[PDB]
Amino acid sequence: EGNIGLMKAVDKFEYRRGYKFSTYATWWIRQAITRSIADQARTIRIPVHMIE
């Protein structure tokens, strides 16, 4: 899931902004891990809003 996060982060990276890649990629990989663990870690799915 974090790997998918990297692919999506690379697809929309901007180096005009001058920040390093790790800072932007960490956020997207965080989102990947959290969304996947909210959607697929239970036998009975609990919607994302109820997860938060």
Next chain:
DNA sequence: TTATGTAATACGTCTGTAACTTGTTCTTATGTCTGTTATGTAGTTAATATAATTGAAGGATTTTAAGA
């Protein structure tokens, strides 16, 4: 003997009950449409950070494939 007149008696029968049936009329339960709110889904965030992880343990014998 025979007309006459009462009387038993059997059969129509006029009327009172009841069954079959429909009109229609009113009431209600249901199916459906529509409007509103809550639920469910999805996208994004920009100091930097760059090889897990947690145990677990006094077994005793057989048979059968790999390695040499």
